[PDB]
Design an enzyme around this catalytic site. Structure first.
Site, PDB file in Angstrom:
ATOM      1  N   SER A 188       0.822  -1.213   0.000  1.00  0.00           N
ATOM      2  CA  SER A 188       0.000   0.000   0.000  1.00  0.00           C
ATOM      3  C   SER A 188       0.853   1.259   0.000  1.00  0.00           C
ATOM      4  CB  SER A 188      -0.943   0.006   1.212  1.00  0.00           C
ATOM      5  OG  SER A 188      -0.211   0.113   2.401  1.00  0.00           O
ATOM      6  N   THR A 189       0.250   2.352  -0.481  1.00  0.00           N
ATOM      7  CA  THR A 189       0.900   3.659  -0.445  1.00  0.00           C
ATOM      8  C   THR A 189       1.278   4.048   0.987  1.00  0.00           C
ATOM      9  OG1 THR A 189      -0.212   4.352  -2.511  1.00  0.00           O
ATOM     10  CG2 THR A 189       0.386   6.114  -0.922  1.00  0.00           C
ATOM     11  N   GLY A 190       0.357   3.825   1.931  1.00  0.00           N
ATOM     12  CA  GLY A 190       0.641   4.190   3.322  1.00  0.00           C
ATOM     13  C   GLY A 190       1.789   3.415   3.946  1.00  0.00           C
ATOM     14  N   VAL A 191       1.831   2.103   3.734  1.00  0.00           N
ATOM     15  CA  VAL A 191       2.983   1.340   4.246  1.00  0.00           C
ATOM     16  C   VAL A 191       4.276   1.673   3.496  1.00  0.00           C
ATOM     17  CG1 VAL A 191       3.907  -0.963   4.702  1.00  0.00           C
ATOM     18  CG2 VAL A 191       1.516  -0.427   5.261  1.00  0.00           C
ATOM     19  N   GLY A 192       4.189   2.027   2.211  1.00  0.00           N
ATOM     20  CA  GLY A 192       5.343   2.515   1.480  1.00  0.00           C
ATOM     21  C   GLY A 192       6.112   3.616   2.198  1.00  0.00           C
ATOM     22  N   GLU A 209       6.449  -0.456  -4.946  1.00  0.00           N
ATOM     23  CA  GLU A 209       5.425  -0.759  -5.910  1.00  0.00           C
ATOM     24  C   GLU A 209       4.106  -0.651  -5.141  1.00  0.00           C
ATOM     25  OE1 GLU A 209       5.794  -1.616  -9.147  1.00  0.00           O
ATOM     26  OE2 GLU A 209       7.943  -1.919  -9.367  1.00  0.00           O
ATOM     27  N   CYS A 243      -2.964  -5.252  -8.615  1.00  0.00           N
ATOM     28  CA  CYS A 243      -2.450  -3.876  -8.492  1.00  0.00           C
ATOM     29  C   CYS A 243      -2.724  -3.031  -9.719  1.00  0.00           C
ATOM     30  CB  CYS A 243      -0.963  -3.857  -8.188  1.00  0.00           C
ATOM     31  SG  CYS A 243      -0.112  -4.579  -9.497  1.00  0.00           S
TER      32      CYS A 243
END
Ligand SMILES: [K+]
Ligand SMILES: [K+]
Ligand SMILES: [K+]
Ligand SMILES: [K+]
Lengths: 447, 452
Positions: A188-192, A209, A243
Site C-alpha cells: 500500500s501507499t501508506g505502508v510505502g 510498488e 495492483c
C-alpha cells in the site's frame, strides 16, 4: 534474535564472495526452476487455499511469469554483467571509460498477498541474478503460500544467502531495523511511507510498488464488444485483487448502458450464471477485506451482482452505474470485484479527472483513435499505460514495471531488475604516463 | 509564508503546461548560458569572496562544467525526450511498445557550499531539461554566491517556475515540509537521512550525493612522480574542499618517504614555497570548519605544513605520516588540505581496509598493473572509480555521477540527469480489433490440463 541472526548469516555469506561468479548465480536460478517444476502441485494447493485459484490460473496468471523471468535472466546474465564501455571525448581518447555493475549486498524483498508467489519470487530472481543475498518476507495474509515458501526455498536454494523470515507486522517492523543494501516492497501507499522511513535510517535505496486507482477511459465511438471483454478479464481476474486492475471506468453517458450490457455478457461467458460455482473465479483474501469491499457496494446502484457470502469470502462480480466520484467506492483502491462507472462529458474532462487525483500505477484507455490515445498519454502521468488492453503491459520483458508519485518509485522486470539490484559504477582508467595535454589544469594559473 | 507561496507558484506554473514544449526548455537553458556570460565577473567576485577562488579556477574548476552541460543537453534534448520504442515479442509484434518520458513536476535542488555555483545550477540544468519547475535552496555558508543567485536567477529565468529560497537550516526544514516530486541534495551523509525521511512523507524520490573518505591507493611499482602530481592537484584544489578529493593515501611503508617528497615537490610547483601568497590556493569556508580541520592535525606526525591562520582561514598544505587509522583525521571526511598517509602491507590489506569502512563516493588507485586495477575494482564498492587520475571521472558526460551506500543514492550528469528528473513510463498500445490469439487467456480455463 532469529531475525538478526538470519540477516547476519546472509551478510557474512555475501561478504565471502560466494555470489560473485555468474556460475553460482545461475546454479541458484536453476534451483528455482527446479523448485517451480517439482513443487507445482504444492504451489497450486497453496494458491487455491489462499485465493481460490486453480491449477490453470495459478500457472498462467502467476507462476509462468517467474519461470519466464528466470529463463531470460540466465540467458542474458553474461551480457548484462559485462563492463559496458561508454562514449569518449577528444580529451579521453587514450582512456578506458566504462560502467561496472556490482551487487548491492543484502536485498530485502517484502512480498504481498494477492500474487504471493510472483510478488515474492519474481523480485528475488532479479536480485539473485545481480549477485546479492536476498532476504524474503512473505505476507502473512496469504498464509498457505507463506508457510510453503518457508519450507521449500531452503530446500532448493543456499540456506544462508536466501532466508525466509516468518511472521506478520511486528516481525516486519523488527526486520526493518536490520541493515539492508536495497529494499523492494509491494503493497500500500501508506505502508510505502513507513518502509521508506525505515530505509532512511541506513540510507537504503528502495523500490516501492504501491497503489492507487487505475482509471479506464472508454472512448465513445470504439468497438465495445472487444473493449468490454478485455476490461472484464482484467478487472475480475483474481476476484479484482490486482495492483493494475482497471479500478473504475470513465465514459460518456451515451455509452454507459452499452458498457454494462457488454460487461455482463462477458462475465456470463467467463463465469456462468452463478460465478460462485465457477472454478475460475477467485475469493477475497480475508474477512477484513471482504467486509471492506462489501461496504463499498452500500449506497450504490447495482447493475449486476451486488451479493456476497461472508463465510467463503465470495463477492459476486458487480457493476455500479452513475457513480458519484465523492462516494466511498471512488475514494479508495477497490481491490475487489466491484466496477464503478463514472460519467464524463469529454476527453478533456476525463484528463482533468485523472490529473486531479493521485498518479495511478496504470492508466488504461480504449479507443480506435490514435490521436485520443496520444493526447491522454501526453496530458496525464501514471506508472505505465496500456491502450486497448489491460494488465499485459506489466508482463513484458522490455517494459519496466513501476509507479510514480503515490503509486511508487523505482521499477523492475527484465534488464531493469538487474540494474535495480546493482550499483552501476562509473569507471575511468587512464595511463600513468606524462601527458602534456593535462598540464594546463595545474597551478599556477595563467595571467 | 514566503516558502509556501514560492512552491505554490511553481506548481501552478508547472500545471499550466508551459514547460512541456521543448522550445520553452531550450529557451530557459539558453537564458542560463546568457547568465553565465553576462554575470561572469559577478560570479568570480562571489567565489573569490566565499572561497578565495580566482577568475581562472572559478571558470575552469566550476563554471565551465555548467556551460558544457547546458550545451550538451540542448543538443541532445529532442532525442532524449522522444518516445523510445523497445523490443517486441511474437505476442506483441503487431502492437507498439515504448517508453514515454515526462516531467515529475516540481523538483527541489538543495545546493552545498564548496562548489556553490556548480552544485546548484548543474542539477537545475538537468531538471529544467526534463520539463520540471525547479525550486533552488542555496547553502548559506557560501553567502556571497547565495545572495548573488537569489538576485540573478530571476533576472534570466522564468520567475514563477524557478524560485530561489533564502535562509539557513530552519528555512530548509520548512521547505522540506512542502510537497515536491523529486529532491536532489548534495551534502553530508547525516543530513541525507533527514532529507530522505522528509521525502518519505510525500513519497518523493531522492537523489542524494553524500560523503565519505575517498581512498587513494598507490601501488609500490608505479611512477610516483606522475602519481603524486595528480594526487596533489586533486587533494589541494579548493583548499581540500571537494566531495571526490582523494581524502587519504594507502601505500606500502617502503614508498611513504618518496610519496612525501614528490607531494612536496608538486605543492611547491603549484603554490610556491609559501602557499599563503598564491592566488591559486583557496581558503576554508568558515570559522567552524577552520577549527574542525585544524583539530585533525593535533597529535599527528607532520611531514609538511601543519599550520594555519584563523584570521584568514588559511591552512597550509599539510601531509601527515604513519597515521593511526583510529585517529580523528582518519575517522571523518577531512574536507581540508590535510593529507594522511596510512600504511598497508599489500593490495589485499588495502582492499580489506576499504571494505571495512563505509562505501566512498570515489575510489582511486595508481598503478601501471592492469590486474591490480581490475582486482581492486572487482573486490570493493564505491560511487565511481578513477585509475591513475583523480576528480576527472565526475566531469564526463558519459559517466553518471553518484554514490552508493553512505555516499548516496541515484545519479546525474548528462543523459542521466534527464532520466533522473523524468518519469519513464512504459506504454503498450494495441489495435482495438478482435485478436484470436488473445482468447486463450479468457475463462473458462481448459478443464483438462496439458504439459507446460
Ligand atoms: K449512483
Ligand atoms: K600549468
Ligand atoms: K528517447
Ligand atoms: K478461453
Amino acid at each position: 534474535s532469529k531475525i538478526s541472526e538470519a540477516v547476519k548469516r546472509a551478510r557474512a555469506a555475501f561478504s565471502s564472495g560466494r555470489t560473485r561468479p555468474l556460475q553460482f548465480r545461475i546454479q541458484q536460478l536453476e534451483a528455482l526452476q527446479r523448485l517451480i517444476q517439482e513443487q507445482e502441485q504444492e504451489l497450486v494447493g497453496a494458491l487455491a487455499a489462499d485465493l481460490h485459484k486453480n491449477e490453470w490460473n495459478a500457472y498462467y496468471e502467476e507462476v509462468v511469469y517467474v519461470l519466464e523471468e528466470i529463463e531470460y535472466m540466465i540467458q542474458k546474465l553474461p551480457e548484462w554483467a559485462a563492463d559496458e564501455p561508454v562514449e569518449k571525448t577528444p580529451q579521453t581518447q587514450q582512456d578506458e571509460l566504462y560502467i561496472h555493475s556490482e551487487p548491492l549486498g543484502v536485498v530485502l524483498v517484502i512480498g504481498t498477498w494477492n500474487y504471493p508467489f510472483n510478488l515474492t519470487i519474481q523480485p528475488m530472481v532479479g536480485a539473485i541474478a545481480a549477485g546479492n543475498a536476498v532476504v524474503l518476507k512473505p505476507s502473512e495474509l496469504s498464509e498457505n503460500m507463506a508457510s510453503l515458501l518457508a519450507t521449500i526455498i531452503p530446500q532448493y536454494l543456499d540456506k544462508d544467502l536466501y532466508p525466509v523470515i516468518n511472521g506478520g507486522v511486528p516481525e516486519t517492523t523488527e526486520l526493518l531495523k536490520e541493515r539492508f543494501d536495497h529494499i523492494l516492497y509491494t503493497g500500500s501507499t501508506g505502508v510505502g511511507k513507513i518502509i521508506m522511513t525505515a530505509a532512511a535510517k541506513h540510507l537504503t535505496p528502495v523500490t516501492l510498488e504501491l497503489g492507487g486507482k487505475s482509471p479506464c477511459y472508454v472512448d465513445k465511438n470504439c468497438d465495445l464488444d472487444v473493449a468490454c471483454r478485455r476490461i472484464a478479464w482484467g478487472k475480475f481476474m483474481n476476484s479484482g485483487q490486482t495492483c493494475v486492475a482497471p479500478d473504475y471506468i470513465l465514459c460518456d453517458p451515451s455509452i454507459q448502458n452499452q458498457i454494462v450490457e457488454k460487461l455482463k455478457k462477458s462475465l456470463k461467458e467467463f463465469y456462468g450464471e452463478d460465478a460462485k460455482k465457477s472454478r475460475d473465479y477467485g475469493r477475497i483474501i480475508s474477512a477484513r477485506h471482504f467486509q471492506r469491499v462489501m461496504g463499498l457496494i452500500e449506497g450504490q446502484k447495482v447493475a449486476y451482482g451486488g451479493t456476497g457470502d461472508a463465510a467463503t469470502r465470495y463477492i459476486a462480480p458487480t457493476i455500479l452505474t452513475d457513480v458519484d466520484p465523492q462516494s466511498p467506492v471512488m475514494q479508495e483502491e477497490i481491490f475487489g470485484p466491484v466496477l464503478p462507472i463514472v460519467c464524463v462529458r469529454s476527453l478533456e474532462e476525463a484528463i482533468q479527472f485523472i490529473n486531479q487525483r493521485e498518479k495511478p500505477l496504470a492508466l488504461y484507455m480504449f479507443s480506435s483513435n490514435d490521436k485520443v490515445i496520444k493526447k491522454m498519454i501526453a496530458e496525464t502521468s501514471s506508472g505505465g499505460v496500456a491502450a486497448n488492453d489491460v494488465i499485459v503491459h506489466i508482463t513484458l520483458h522490455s517494459l519496466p514495471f513501476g509507479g510514480v508519485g503515490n503509486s511508487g518509485m523505482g521499477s523492475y522486470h527484465g534488464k531493469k531488475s538487474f540494474e535495480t539490484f546493482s550499483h552501476r559504477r562509473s569507471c575511468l582508467v587512464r595511463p600513468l604516463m606524462n601527458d602534456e595535454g593535462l598540464k594546463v589544469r595545474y597551478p599556477p594559473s595563467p595571467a
